[PDB]
């Protein structure tokens, strides 16, 4: 059902919705969505649970 | 010292108008226009006025009357002075 409410289809689309979620109103870019999403929880720089 | 004001409140009903009247009379004493109607115990004008209320010799009626008289008492003096202002014509 979670999928039944999912507006997206493919990776790039989801990344678009996420990038437009975090930084709304400004035009989304591929490199932008990728960079943001990779930099949120996956970067050694911006993320640590230690 | 007046420990309770209840008797003065008996003499004039309102108890707010008591504060007002007593204040008026109190100023009649404090600014030196007049003198007490009852022996001063070293009681300040504040309490003297209230004692004057308790004795029933001071209230709104009496004060208004007295003032109304004094108006004409000044009119009596200034009569000849102000009637001399006929230069107005």
């Amino acid at each position: 059902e979670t999928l039944r409410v999912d507006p997206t289809n493919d990776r790039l689309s989801a990344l678009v919705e996420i990038y437009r979620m975090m930084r709304p109103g400004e035009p989304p870019t591929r490199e932008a969505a990728e960079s943001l999403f990779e930099n949120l929880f996956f970067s050694e720089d911006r993320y640590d649970l230690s | 010292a007046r420990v309770t004001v209840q008797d003065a409140v008996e003499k004039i009903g309102n108890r707010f108008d008591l504060v007002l009247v007593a204040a008026r009379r109190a100023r009649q004493m404090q600014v030196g226009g007049k003198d007490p109607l009852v022996p001063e115990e070293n009681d300040k004008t504040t309490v003297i006025a209230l004692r004057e209320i308790e004795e029933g010799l001071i209230n709104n009626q009496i004060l208004d009357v007295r003032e109304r008289q004094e108006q004409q008492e000044q009119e009596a003096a200034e009569l000849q002075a102000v009637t001399a202002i006929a230069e107005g014509r």
């Binding site: - | 010292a1 204040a23 009681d43």
Partner: protein, 1166 residues
């Protein structure tokens, strides 16, 4: 006569929108530059936010350039740089302006929740904002072509439409657009058309909105406001000293945030003028216009767009809206508080030597406080040459000044106040007594009123200055003048702890003591017998006494007799004044009895005797308690010998039920209940063991072998007298303490077996800790809830004041004893006491009027009613009062610290709110939140429903989520049918008749229903009875009066049904309405008089409506109130308390009631 032009003592106030020309009228110059000060010579750069020319001279009576320095040249405008030399204070006054390049929306009227520009134009907000940002084009005065007047177009669309129609069509964009829209708008024509459209089409949806909007429009027209003024052509600049640049230590400067904002605005403005003169491309000048809009918005009210930040500092900058609003919720500096001269404070101590009319005031404190009086009194007697020398003297603290201070102190009262001020007794006036020390001494009997412990609480002193303040403090706020709680006629001066242990120890009797059985002439030789050590304080003895009864006519009868009493009672009798019978002192004298002594004394002898009586009671209580040698040891707390056995047996029960759970005879939960019950029973048994043993165990011999009486043990005497301690706490000391409960509220089945006299071990203490922390938390929270509640209360009441004398209506509520379910949860006598009778009442036989129509029922009248069997009295109330915009004193009641009828002009709403509020700390659906729910008139979660109309009912249709109920009135039409969800179990009988307001289901019911289907008396009775249930369950005494005035404020507004003057469905004042239909019943239309329907508004809701807007701007959301008032051009006449408090003149109540009245009649007259 020439009325006037220049300064008078003003009345009312007016608020409205501001014309550009008006803004110019205020402006004494246009600030053209962002510059502030020159940066070396700190002089103001001319025409800048800080300016000498526009605003004023930097220093007093001195030109900026320095040419004219003399106090002579004044009205002179300097030739070099024009500055009229005048006090620097005028730089705190004179306004300024800025002429903006492009028009600008005033953010208050754009972003106020009901957007003013938006609903005036019937244009949606998002559209308007889309227009202001140059994100689209909007039509103005479309003429007849293709297009609506308010229609919005895009770039390409505007181009196409323009190509089609060159003229006879118009479209703009940006601020100029909206301004052009507002200017073009003709309100009157819209009025006509909307009246017509209202008339033609029948739909609820259509004519609701139609009528709302037409009313809005015509109100705006009547205001005098022209819509254009919502768009700012000119922007006023605030006076420099109200946003100062003033220097600090280290040579650093500090300035208000309004300077950054104003600076930004001026900058972008000038840059826009520049960009216009440079013929810039559209994309640029548009950006600049937008930025200017943002800057202006940020200046006026910041945070409705971007929340701009101040230079180099992250924290957002405070705007003018934030200047007005303040902080700490809604506080306008007359609200949160204001610092005050001639004041002080310090730690407080006892001072039992004091009479109740005085207080110890520290020497130094008195000197500093009365310093100006001292200066004047010093040179009046001629001890000091001049005021300077006087200062030198009091600073030197020369010997002679102390006497002068004793002079200025004598008849001059001082105001004493404590930290949590709730009821009016939180501040009391005292006669100062000079004391060596830094501590304030406060009379013990007053400690109850302040709720002041001695554990380091502080009190603040305020010196009444003006004569009127001295006399107010002495005749009103004076301690001796309030002996009785305004909430209920019972004395607040009741002896507290040590004193009552004294009087209790005094009159009490042991079985055998020195002087047992002998006889004495009178109290004198009784006391003489005691002090000589011959006779014991407590011994059964016959002594002759002379008592009095005033029961003759105004006259004291004398009677003498041999009374069977004790030595102590005989001694104490010496104090009791005059007409009181010896019966009052011949008892054991507990706290309650020792209080009723005072009460009776007051209701018999009058004020003064009661005062001095209480004084003597305090003195003797302290002295004899001191003599008594009462103490507390570890052996004073006696544990039951049978305790361990009870523990053991009750511990056997748990292993019984445990064995049953092991064998499975009983379920786990049932087991749980069983064990919990056996342990609870155990605690009850131990408590009722230690209570018997502690209470009666004194076993003592008189001439025989044995006799037993009530114990003389210290802790018992303390708990019994009412001095301190209670059965619960004593139970915690000797007997085991309770059963605790986890934060969940699941009560632990292994209670604390040990007590405080014994030790508690680790676990027991840990478990007790939660109870402690939750206790402190809950109490400290209920303080806040109390405060909030009182606040809502005075907000809803306030301006209600006794105004007229007697409205003279027979109307009132039926007063019966509360009679709940058992016997008499509260008598009739308390409920009807001090209350005026609505009409004459009867004996069982008649044409005999005991109480004659309207008469204050005092103690004698109530006792006369009590002699006869009368169960019922109809009583006038504040809720039923015919008087509009206030209560008549004849309706209210007598209640006050004085037994006489309520004075004309006392503000009752406030004291009612306070009276309800103060005990609120002592309240535990039920509870204080229940009280709040009641006063908020909140529809409960699972409410019942009452029969809409009387007559036989039955069930209809089916199961759609509602199974419909059909009611059938006898004579009248049936059609009333209500949809009752059938999934709720019903009550009402399908075959039986049900009266209107019967139970068609179960559960609590919303008081809206009680008001509509039962009616006003029924609803006020429901509220008062339920809230009084809550309070009285906690042992709180509150007279029905205060609750009834709050109730009156709740129902103040009502909705009309019929017509002939004003609109149909409007909620409005029943004062206004009733005074209008009473006026309409004759003259006017012969009778056109409308029918209304009484409405119930919650206290927080009813507080919303206030005539005065200044008042509303205090406790409500300020930003909205100011706008909403400004559009209507609302004119605030003051007339209330809060408003006059804000504006800083005399309160239209109390002493000021003579002023405001005399002025009120002068108004609207010749």
């Amino acid at each position: 006569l020439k009325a006037q032009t220049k300064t008078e003592e003003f009345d009312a106030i007016k608020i409205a929108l501001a014309s550009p020309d008006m803004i110019r009228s205020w402006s004494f110059g246009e600030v053209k530059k962002p510059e502030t000060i020159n940066y070396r010579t700190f002089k103001p750069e001319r025409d800048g936010l800080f300016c000498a020319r526009i605003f004023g001279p930097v220093k007093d009576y001195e030109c900026l350039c320095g040419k004219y320095k003399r106090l002579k040249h004044r009205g002179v405008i300097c030739e070099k740089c024009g500055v009229e030399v005048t006090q620097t204070k005028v730089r705190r006054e004179r306004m300024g302006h800025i002429e903006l390049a492009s028009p600008t929306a005033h953010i208050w009227f754009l972003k106020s929740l009901p957007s003013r520009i938006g609903l005036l134009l019937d244009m949606p907000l998002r559209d308007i904002e889309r227009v202001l940002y140059f994100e689209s084009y909007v039509v103005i005065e479309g003429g007849m072509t293709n297009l609506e007047r308010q229609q919005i177009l895009t770039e390409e669309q505007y181009l196409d439409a323009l190509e089609e129609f060159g003229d006879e069509f118009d479209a703009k964009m940006g601020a100029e657009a909206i301004q052009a829209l507002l200017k073009s708008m003709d309100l009157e024509q819209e009025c006509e058309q909307l009246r017509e459209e209202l008339n033609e089409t029948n739909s609820e949806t259509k004519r609701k909105k139609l009528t709302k909007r037409i009313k809005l429009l015509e109100a705006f027209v009547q205001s005098g406001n022209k819509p254009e003024w919502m768009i700012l052509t000119v922007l006023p600049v605030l006076p420099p000293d109200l946003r100062p640049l003033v220097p600090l230590d280290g040579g650093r400067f500090a300035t208000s945030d309004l300077n950054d904002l104003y600076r930004r605005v001026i900058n972008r403005n000038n840059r826009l003028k520049r960009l216009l003169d440079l013929a810039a491309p559209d994309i640029i000048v548009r950006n600049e216009k937008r930025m200017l809009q943002e800057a202006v918005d940020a200046l006026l009210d910041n945070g409705r767009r971007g929340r701009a930040i101040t230079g180099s500092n992250k924290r957002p900058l405070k705007s003018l809206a934030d200047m007005i609003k303040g902080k700490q919720g809604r506080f306008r500096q007359n609200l949160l508080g204001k610092r005050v001269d001639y004041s002080g404070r310090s730690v407080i101590t006892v001072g039992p030597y004091l009479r109740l009319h005085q207080c110890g005031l520290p020497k130094k404190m008195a000197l500093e406080l009365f310093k100006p009086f001292i200066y004047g009194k010093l040179e009046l007697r001629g001890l000091a040459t001049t005021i300077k020398a006087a200062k030198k003297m009091v600073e030197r603290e020369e010997a002679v000044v102390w006497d002068i201070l004793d002079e200025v102190i004598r008849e001059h009262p001082v105001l004493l106040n404590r930290a949590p001020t709730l009821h009016r007794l939180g501040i009391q006036a005292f006669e100062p007594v000079l004391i060596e020390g830094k501590a304030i001494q406060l009379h013990p009997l007053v400690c109850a009123a302040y709720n002041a412990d001695f554990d380091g609480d502080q009190m603040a002193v305020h010196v009444p200055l003006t004569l009127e303040a001295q006399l107010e403090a002495r005749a009103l706020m004076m301690s001796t003048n309030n002996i009785l709680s305004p909430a209920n006629g019972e004395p607040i001066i009741v002896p507290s702890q040590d004193v009552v242990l004294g009087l209790y120890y005094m009159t009490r009797d042991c079985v055998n003591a020195k002087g047992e059985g002998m006889v004495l002439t009178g109290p004198k030789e009784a006391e003489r017998l005691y002090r000589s050590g011959l006779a014991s304080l407590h011994a059964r003895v016959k002594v002759r006494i002379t008592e009095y009864e005033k029961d003759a006519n105004g006259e004291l009868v004398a009677k003498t007799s041999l009374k069977d009493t004790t030595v102590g009672r005989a001694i104490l009798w010496m104090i009791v004044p005059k007409g009181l019978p010896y019966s009052i002192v011949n008892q054991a004298l507990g706290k309650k009895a020792i209080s009723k002594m005072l009460n009776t004394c007051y209701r018999i002898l009058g004020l003064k005797p009661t005062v001095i009586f209480a004084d003597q009671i305090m003195y003797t209580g302290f002295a004899y308690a001191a003599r008594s040698g009462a103490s507390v040891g570890i052996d004073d707390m006696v544990i039951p010998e049978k305790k361990h056995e009870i523990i053991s047996e009750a511990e056997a029960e748990v292993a019984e039920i445990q064995e049953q759970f092991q064998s499975g005879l009983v379920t786990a939960g049932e087991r749980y209940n069983k064990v919990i019950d056996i342990w609870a029973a155990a605690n009850d048994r131990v408590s009722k063991a230690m209570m018997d043993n502690l209470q009666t165990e004194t076993v003592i011999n008189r001439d025989g072998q044995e006799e037993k009486q009530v114990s003389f043990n210290s802790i018992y005497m303390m708990a019994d007298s009412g001095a301190r301690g209670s059965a619960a706490q004593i139970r915690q000391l000797a007997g085991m303490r309770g059963l605790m409960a986890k934060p969940d509220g699941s009560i632990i089945e292994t209670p604390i077996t040990a007590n405080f006299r014994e030790g508690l071990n680790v676990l027991q203490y840990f478990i007790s800790t939660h109870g402690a922390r939750k206790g402190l938390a809950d109490t400290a929270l209920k303080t806040a809830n109390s405060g909030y509640l009182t606040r809502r209360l005075v907000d809803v009441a306030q301006d209600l004041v006794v105004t007229e004398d007697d409205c003279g209506t027979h109307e009132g509520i039926m007063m019966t004893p509360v009679i709940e379910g058992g016997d008499v949860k509260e008598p009739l006598r308390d409920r009807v006491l001090g209350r005026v009778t609505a009409e004459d009442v009867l004996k069982p036989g008649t044409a005999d009027i005991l109480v004659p129509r309207n008469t204050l029922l005092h103690e004698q009248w109530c006792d006369l009613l009590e002699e006869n069997s009368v169960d019922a009295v109809k009583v006038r109330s504040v809720v039923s009062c015919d008087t509009d915009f206030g209560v008549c004193a004849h309706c209210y009641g007598r209640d006050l610290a004085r037994g006489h009828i309520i004075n004309k002009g006392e503000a009752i709403g406030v004291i009612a709110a306070q009276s309800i509020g103060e005990p609120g700390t002592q309240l535990t659906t039920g509870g204080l939140p229940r009280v709040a729910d009641l006063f908020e008139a909140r529809r409960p979660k699972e409410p019942a429903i009452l029969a809409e109309i009387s007559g036989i009912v039955s069930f209809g249709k089916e199961t759609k989520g509602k199974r419909r109920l059909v009611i059938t009135p006898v004579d009248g039409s049936d059609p009333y049918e209500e949809m009752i969800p059938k999934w709720r179990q019903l009550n009402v009988f399908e075959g039986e008749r049900v009266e209107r307001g019967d139970v068609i289901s179960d559960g609590p019911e919303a008081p809206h229903d009680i008001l509509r289907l039962r009616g006003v008396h029924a609803v006020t009775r429901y509220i008062v009875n339920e809230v009084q249930d809550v309070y009285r369950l906690q042992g709180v005494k509150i007279n029905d009066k205060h609750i009834e005035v709050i109730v009156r404020q709740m129902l103040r507004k009502a909705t009309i049904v019929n017509a002939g003057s004003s609109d149909f469905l409007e909620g409005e004042q029943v004062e206004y309405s009733r005074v209008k239909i009473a006026n309409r019943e004759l003259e006017a239309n012969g009778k056109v008089g409308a029918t209304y329907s009484r409405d119930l508004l919650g206290i927080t809701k009813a507080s919303l409506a206030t005539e005065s807007f200044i008042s509303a701007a205090s406790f409500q959301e300020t930003t909205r109130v100011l706008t909403e008032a400004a559009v209507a051009g609302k004119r605030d006449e003051l007339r209330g308390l809060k408003e006059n408090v804000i504006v800083g003149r005399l309160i239209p109540a109390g002493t000021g009631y003579a002023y405001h009245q005399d002025r009120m009649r002068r108004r609207a007259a010749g």
